[PDB]
Design a protein around this motif. Structure first.
Motif, short mmCIF file in Angstrom:
data_model
loop_
_atom_site.label_atom_id
_atom_site.label_comp_id
_atom_site.label_asym_id
_atom_site.label_seq_id
_atom_site.Cartn_x
_atom_site.Cartn_y
_atom_site.Cartn_z
N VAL B 70 0.94 -0.96 -0.02
CA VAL B 70 0.28 0.40 -0.16
C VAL B 70 0.96 1.31 0.35
O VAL B 70 1.56 0.90 0.48
N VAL B 71 0.63 2.83 -0.53
CA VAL B 71 1.37 3.28 -1.18
C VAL B 71 0.32 4.44 -0.88
O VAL B 71 -1.10 3.90 -1.23
N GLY B 72 -0.39 5.56 -0.18
CA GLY B 72 -1.48 7.03 -0.69
C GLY B 72 -1.27 8.15 -0.02
O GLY B 72 0.06 7.76 0.44
N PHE B 73 -2.16 8.54 0.47
CA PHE B 73 -1.94 9.77 1.08
C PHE B 73 -3.62 10.31 1.37
O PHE B 73 -4.82 9.73 1.08
N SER B 74 -3.64 10.87 2.68
CA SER B 74 -4.96 11.16 3.83
C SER B 74 -4.58 12.39 3.69
O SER B 74 -4.39 13.39 4.49
N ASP B 75 -4.84 13.29 1.93
CA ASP B 75 -4.01 14.77 1.90
C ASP B 75 -5.08 15.63 2.23
O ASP B 75 -5.33 16.75 1.51
N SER B 76 -5.26 15.00 4.09
CA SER B 76 -6.45 15.86 4.61
C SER B 76 -4.93 17.64 4.92
O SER B 76 -4.86 17.65 6.41
N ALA B 77 -5.58 18.16 3.71
CA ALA B 77 -4.30 19.25 4.16
C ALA B 77 -2.74 18.94 4.43
O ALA B 77 -2.20 19.54 5.24
N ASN B 78 -2.08 18.03 4.06
CA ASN B 78 -0.95 17.79 3.99
C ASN B 78 -0.12 16.89 3.25
O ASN B 78 0.37 16.58 3.80
N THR B 79 -0.63 17.07 2.22
CA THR B 79 0.29 16.96 0.82
C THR B 79 0.56 18.18 -0.38
O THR B 79 0.05 19.03 0.25
N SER B 80 1.54 17.54 -0.96
CA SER B 80 2.19 18.28 -1.86
C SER B 80 0.83 18.50 -2.84
O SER B 80 0.96 19.60 -4.12
N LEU B 81 -0.53 18.91 -2.11
CA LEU B 81 -1.68 18.86 -2.84
C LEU B 81 -1.92 19.97 -4.09
O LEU B 81 -1.22 20.70 -3.70
N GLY B 82 -2.24 19.51 -5.86
CA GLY B 82 -2.00 20.04 -6.25
C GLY B 82 -3.20 21.52 -5.45
O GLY B 82 -3.78 21.49 -5.36
N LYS B 83 -2.36 22.26 -5.65
CA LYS B 83 -2.67 23.68 -4.98
C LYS B 83 -3.33 24.33 -5.87
O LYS B 83 -3.67 25.44 -6.55
N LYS B 84 -5.07 23.42 -5.26
CA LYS B 84 -5.66 24.23 -6.00
C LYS B 84 -5.77 24.42 -7.51
O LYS B 84 -6.95 25.27 -8.26
N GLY B 85 -4.62 23.87 -8.13
CA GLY B 85 -4.77 24.01 -9.75
C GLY B 85 -4.63 22.67 -10.61
O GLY B 85 -5.47 22.50 -11.13
#
Ligand SMILES: N[C@@H](CN(O)N=O)C(=O)O
Ligand SMILES: N[C@@H](CN(O)N=O)C(=O)O
Ligand SMILES: N[C@@H](CN(O)N=O)C(=O)O
Ligand SMILES: N[C@@H](CN(O)N=O)C(=O)O
Ligand SMILES: [Zn+2]
Lengths: 153, 310, 310, 310, 310
Positions: B70-85
Motif C-alpha cells: 500500500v502507498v497513499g495519502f490522507s491529503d487532509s491538508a498535509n500533502t503537496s496537494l495540487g495547490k487547487k491547480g
C-alpha cells in the motif's frame, strides 16, 4: 420538657412533612433541593406501603417550615403530594403543590449553546401548562422545551 | 474470469443482485479461510483526498490481509496537494501508472467515476464521494445482516435517526429493496425524514414501509435496528435536543426485542447509542465494523484476481 | 508458551525481573540472528494519537524487520479523528477487530490501560501515555546498559538534568532498583530534583544514592552517565540559563572518565550534549537509539509468537 | 427622565409598543437634526465577542455621531479573553467599572442577559446573542418600514427565504404583530418554513397570514418585500439549487409591484437579490442599512441621556 | 512642571516614594473631580505587540476619560509589523513621529526601555514587557491598598499563590518595602516560593516576613490578602491538584478576618477564588480593577500635562 418518645422510625413535632411522594422521587427532592443541608433533624422513609396498592416515599424534617412559593416547587416532581405543616397541624388551606410561575436553581437548560452552563448564575425557567405537556422557557437563551425534554437531556 | 474481475466499484446501484451475492459469498469464504498471499505482488493506492481514518484503516488492513502493498495519502491538508491547480484527472492519470488498483475517498460527488475515465485498465474502488456513494459501507452492512439473520429477504428493518442526509441508509434501503418481502420501519424527526424519492421507489416495487415516531412502536417486530448518526449542525442546538427524544437508544428499550435482533450503526455513535447497550447481545456495531475487512477484502479479491476463492 | 505471550505491555512496573531478563535476552538473540519472517502474516496498528516521529519510526521499523504489516495514523491533527466526540474506548473496540496488535502513543495518562479493557484478546503495547509510562524506552535503556556494561547490577549510575519531570529517568531508576548493589548519583538544579517518592523507594530497599551539583563531582566513578533533556519552558529563560551551568556536557569533562563509561540520552539532546562529545568513545546515545529496534522487536516477538526465539 | 433611561436593551419582546414608538420617534428626530455633542463625555464599550463588521461599524459610527468615545474588541482570537476558564461574568464585572455603557455581540444565546446581572448600573445593549435576540436590527427594520410606508399598521408584508432559522424575521414578525391590521405572506421552501410557534401567535391575535410558493404569487399586494439570507451550509448543495428556484429576486419580478413597495434584506444578499434590482425604486436594503445609524443612535441617546431629544 | 512631566514610565524601581505619592495623589484627585478635557488635543499610541485585552481596555479608557485621541494595534498577527527583520527600534522611530505618547506592551523584557532610546522627546509608558516590569499594575494595587487601608505603611500583607513567577507580586512587594512597618506573610507551595533575592532585600531593610502553608494560618492578622494566579502550564497537572489545596480562597475561610481586610487579585481568578467570595465585603478585585483607570489616568496626566491636577 414535653416531647415524649425515643422514635427512630416514625415520629412528630414542630416540623414540616411531605406526604405521598412517588417511588424514586423522594431522594431526588433531597438532592435537587439539598434538604439535608439542614442542622435540624430529618426522618425519611422510602418505598413504603401506599394507598393500599402501590409504593411511595416519605419525608419528615423537624424544626422547619415550607412556604407557598416552595411547596409549589414540588409540583413538577411530586404533584399529588400533600404537605402537612406539623408544629401540630397548624396548617390552613388544603396545602397541595400547584404549578409555580417560575422554577429556578434545579432545572438544566437542554440548549447546549445556552450561556447559563459555564457561568455563575442560577438556572431559571418560566412555566406554562400544556395539553399533555409542560413548557419551560429559559430566562437566558429564551428557548422553550417540554419538561419531558428538560428532565431527560 | 469472475464477473467483477477488473471492474470499477463506484456505485452500489451498478451492482446487480448476483454481484451483491458474489461479493457476500466471497467475503464469507475469506472469513472462514484467509488467503494472506492472494494479492502478494500487487501494489494498491489508498488515496484519501478526504480524511477518513476508520474506513481508511479498514480498507488498508484488508489490503495487507491479502498480502498486497500500500502507498497513499490522507491529503487532509498535509500533502503537496495540487495547490487547487492540478485537476483530479491529472492526479489519476499519474497515479494510474504506478499502481494496480486505486481506492479513493473524495469530498466531491462523482470523483470516483471521473477517476474511472482517466485510470488505465486500473480499477477504481470508491471509498466515498461526497454525499453520493459509499459502496463498501453498504456491502459490510448487507454482509452483517446476512450473517446475523441468515438471509437478506423477508426481514423487518427499522432505520432510526437522520434519514434525510444519512446517505448510508439511502444506499442500504435501495440495496435491501433488491430482495423480496422486506419490511421497513422509518423512525426520524420530521425535519430529517426519508426522502420521497426513496418512498417512491418502494411503492414502485410494492415494498411495505411505514413511519413511526419512536423505536418502542416497532421494537417488537424488528430484525435489524439500523441506528444513524445525527449531527447537531444539521439542526440548531435547541432543535436537536428537543427532538433528541428516544431517537437515541438505551438498554431499557430492548426489553421486548426479538432474540435475533441486531442493532447496527455506521459509527460515530457518540450521541445515539448509550453504552449500556454495548453489553446486550443485540449490540452488533463493533462486529459490523469488523465485517468491513471481509467485505472489502472480497472486493479487492474479486477485482484483482480472475478466479474465485474457495 | 512464553510468559509474555499475548500479554499487554503497559507499565514497566507490571514487568517482573524475569520479564525484563526475558525481553533483554530475546533482544540480544534477534540482534545476533534476525528473523525477517517471524511475524509474516501479522498486521499491527501503529496508533500515534500523539505524534512522536522518532519512537514511531523505531516501532514501525521493528515491525517490518519481523515481517509484519503496519496500518496506523499519527493523528497529530491530521485524521478524521473523533471530533472530540468518539471515545477512545470506541476507537479501540473498532481497531481491535482489524489487527493482531495495537501499539499506541497518547497524550493522556492511562490511555493504554484503558485500551486494554476494550481490545479483544488483542494485545496493546504502550508507546507512551502522557507523563506516565514508556515501557519500551526503559527496555532499550536497560538493554543498552547491559550490552555496554555486561550487567545491570553493581553499577554506578549518574542521572543529570531534569529529574523532576523526566519520567524516563523515573522509570529507569525504578527498573535498575530491581537489581542489586546499584549506586546512584543525582545531578540536577534544585528546582528539578528527583522526586522524594523515588528516594523513598531507594531507602526502602537500602539502595545507595546521593545528590551532587556538578557532573565533575562524580565523573570518576560513573559507569553510566544518563543525560536528560531540559525544556526551557519548565523554567523561565533567565532561570534556565542561570542553572544551565555544567548540567550540559562537553568533551573536556570526560578527561577522568572510566574506560567503560557510556553517555546516554533519550535524545532531543540539542541543549545538553555538545557535539564535541559525539566523537569520544563514551558517546552512546545514537547506539542507544539504535537498540530500540531490538528491544521493541523483542516485545513484539514475545507477545505475538508463542515460542522463544533462539 | 425618558422611559428607557438607564434601561438594558436586551430583547425586542421586553419592548412595549410605547417603547418602539419612542425609539422610532427619536430616530426620526436625530435624523432630521443631528446632535454631535449629545454624549460628549461618555465612553462606550463595543464588545464583539463574535465578529460582525457591518453591525460593529454601524454601532460604533452611531456612538461617534453622538460624540461618545469608544473602546472595545472582536474576540475572534484577536484578544486574550477567557483563555482557560475565565467567565463572561468576570469580564463584565471588570469592563462595567470602566465604561458608561456596554454594547456586546456574543455567540451564546443569553449572553447579554447574563451581562446585565454583573454590570451594576451600567446599561447593556444586545448587538446579538447567538440565535436569540437582535433588538437594534429589528428597530432599524421597523424604522425603515415606517419611514417608507408612513406607518407600521395595516400593511401587506411578505417575507421570503429561510424563515425557519432567520431569527431576524422571527423578531420582525413579532414586532409587527404588536401593531394592527397587518397581513403576512410567507414564502419559503417547506424545509425552512416559518415556525409553528410564530403562526400560533399570529392566530391567537387574529392576524391574517398565508403561505405561498412564489413571490409573483403575491407581488401585486405587497407593501414590504422582506428578503432573507439562505445559508448554503443549511441544506444540501443539490437541495439548495433545487429550491433557490425563485426565493431569489430579480428585477423582472417587479413588473406589477406597488409604487410604494420596498424590498428589504438583512444585508448579506449575494445569493438572493440580483444586482439589476439595485436600480429599481423598490430596492431599499442599502437605505435600510443606512437607517441602522439612526435607530442605534436613538437607542444610545435614550439610555444615556435623561431628557428627550431636541 | 510636575516631577514626572515628559518622563518615561518604564520600571517601578525607577520610581521614588515621592513619585509613587504624587501618582497616587493625582489618582485620588481625578477620581474625585474628573477632567475630561485635560488631554484634548493629544494623540496617544496604544501599541500592544502582545495582546492583553483588559489591560488594553483599561489603558485606552483612561486615555479617553482625559479626552485624548487613540491609535494603535495588537500585533498578535493582526498587523503587518516586523515581518522579516524589521526592528522594534525602527517601529518606535516611526511611531514616535506620529504621536504625543507611546503606551506599549511587548513579549520581550526590555522592550519599553529600548523604545525609550528611539522615541526622542516622546514619552513611553510600559504596559508590560515580558517577565520584567509592569509599572501601572503596581500603581493601581498600591492605590487600592491605600484607599481601602488609608495608608501604605504598617500593614499586614499576605501574598498567596505562585510567588516565584508572579512578577506582579515581586513588583508589589518591592513597592511596599519603600514604606515603613509593613509585615509580610508568604503563602505558596515550595516549588513556587517567593524568590530568595526578594527575601534578601527585605532582610537588608529589616522588614518582617514569614512563610506559611495555609491562609487560615494568618487570616486573623492580615489587612490585605493578595491572591495570585497559578498557571496550569507551570507545574504538572497532578502536581497542581495536589497543591492547589487551599492556595484557593473560599468564603468559608473568611470567618475570622479583620473588618478592614480586602482580598485582591491581579484578576484572571477563575482557578483561585470561589465566586461565593464575591458577595463578602472583603472581595475587592473588581474594585481593584476599576482603580486601574485612575492610576493610569494619573500617570498620563502627569507625563503629558505640565502642572498638577485641578
Ligand atoms: N467518518 C469519517 C471517517 N472516519 O475516520 N470514520 O471513522 C468521515 O466520514 O470522514
Ligand atoms: N520526543 C517526541 C517524539 N519524537 O519524534 N521523538 O523523536 C515526543 O515525545 O512527542
Ligand atoms: N453580522 C454578520 C456579519 N456581517 O455581515 N456583519 O456585517 C455575522 O456575524 O454573521
Ligand atoms: N494581560 C493578560 C491578559 N488579560 O487578562 N488581559 O486582561 C496577558 O496578556 O496575559
Ligand atoms: Zn437556556
Amino acid at each position: 420538657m414535653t416531647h415524649d418518645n425515643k422514635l427512630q422510625v416514625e415520629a412528630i413535632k414542630r416540623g414540616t412533612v411531605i406526604d405521598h411522594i412517588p417511588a424514586q422521587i423522594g431522594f431526588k427532592l433531597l438532592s435537587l433541593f439539598k434538604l439535608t443541608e439542614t442542622d435540624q433533624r430529618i426522618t425519611i422513609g422510602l418505598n413504603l406501603p401506599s394507598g393500599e396498592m402501590g409504593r411511595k416515599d416519605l419525608i419528615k424534617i423537624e424544626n422547619t417550615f415550607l412556604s407557598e412559593d416552595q411547596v409549589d416547587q414540588l409540583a413538577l416532581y411530586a404533584p399529588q403530594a400533600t404537605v402537612n405543616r406539623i408544629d401540630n397541624y397548624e396548617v390552613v388551606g388544603k396545602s397541595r403543590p400547584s404549578l409555580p410561575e417560575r422554577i429556578d436553581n434545579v432545572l438544566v437548560c437542554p440548549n447546549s449553546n445556552c450561556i447559563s452552563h459555564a457561568e455563575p448564575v442560577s438556572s431559571s425557567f418560566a412555566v406554562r401548562k400544556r395539553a399533555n405537556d409542560i413548557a419551560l422557557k429559559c430566562k437566558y437563551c429564551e428557548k422553550e422545551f417540554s419538561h419531558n425534554v428538560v428532565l431527560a437531556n | 474470469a469472475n464477473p467483477l474481475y477488473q471492474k470499477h466499484i463506484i456505485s452500489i446501484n451498478d451492482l446487480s443482485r448476483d454481484d451483491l451475492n458474489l461479493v457476500l459469498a466471497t467475503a464469507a469464504k475469506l472469513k472462514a479461510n484467509p488467503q494472506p498471499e492472494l494479492l502478494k505482488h500487487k501494489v494498491i493506492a489508498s488515496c484519501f483526498f478526504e480524511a477518513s481514518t476508520r474506513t481508511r484503516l479498514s480498507f488498508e488492513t484488508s489490503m495487507h490481509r491479502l498480502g498486497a502493498s500500500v502507498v497513499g495519502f490522507s491529503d487532509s491538508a498535509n500533502t503537496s496537494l495540487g495547490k487547487k491547480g492540478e485537476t483530479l484527472a491529472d492526479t489519476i492519470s499519474v497515479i494510474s501508472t504506478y499502481v494496480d488498483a486505486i481506492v479513493m475517498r473524495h469530498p466531491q460527488e462523482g470523483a470516483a467515476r471521473l477517476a474511472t475515465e482517466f485510470s488505465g485498465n486500473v480499477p477504481v474502488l470508491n471509498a466515498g464521494d461526497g454525499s453520493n456513494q459509499h459502496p463498501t459501507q453498504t456491502l459490510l452492512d448487507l454482509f452483517t445482516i446476512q450473517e446475523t439473520q441468515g438471509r437478506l429477504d423477508n426481514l423487518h428493518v427499522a432505520m432510526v435517526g437522520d434519514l434525510k442526509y444519512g446517505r448510508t441508509v439511502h444506499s442500504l434501503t435501495q440495496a435491501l429493496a433488491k430482495f423480496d418481502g422486506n419490511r421497513f420501519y422509518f423512525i426520524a424527526p420530521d425535519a430529517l425524514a426519508m426522502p420521497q424519492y426513496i418512498l417512491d421507489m418502494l411503492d414502485e416495487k410494492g415494498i411495505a414501509w411505514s413511519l413511526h415516531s419512536s423505536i418502542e412502536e416497532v421494537m417488537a417486530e424488528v430484525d435489524i435496528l439500523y441506528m444513524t448518526r445525527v449531527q447537531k449542525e444539521r439542526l440548531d442546538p435547541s432543535e436537536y435536543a428537543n427532538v433528541k427524544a428516544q431517537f437515541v437508544l438505551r438498554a431499557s428499550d430492548l426489553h421486548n426485542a426479538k432474540a435475533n435482533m441486531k442493532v447496527l450503526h455506521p459509527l460515530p455513535r457518540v450521541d445515539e447509542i448509550a453504552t449500556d447497550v454495548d453489553k446486550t447481545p443485540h449490540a452488533w456495531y463493533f462486529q459490523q465494523a469488523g465485517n468491513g475487512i471481509f467485505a472489502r477484502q472480497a472486493l479487492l479479491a474479486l477485482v484483482l484476481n480472475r478466479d474465485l476463492v474457495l
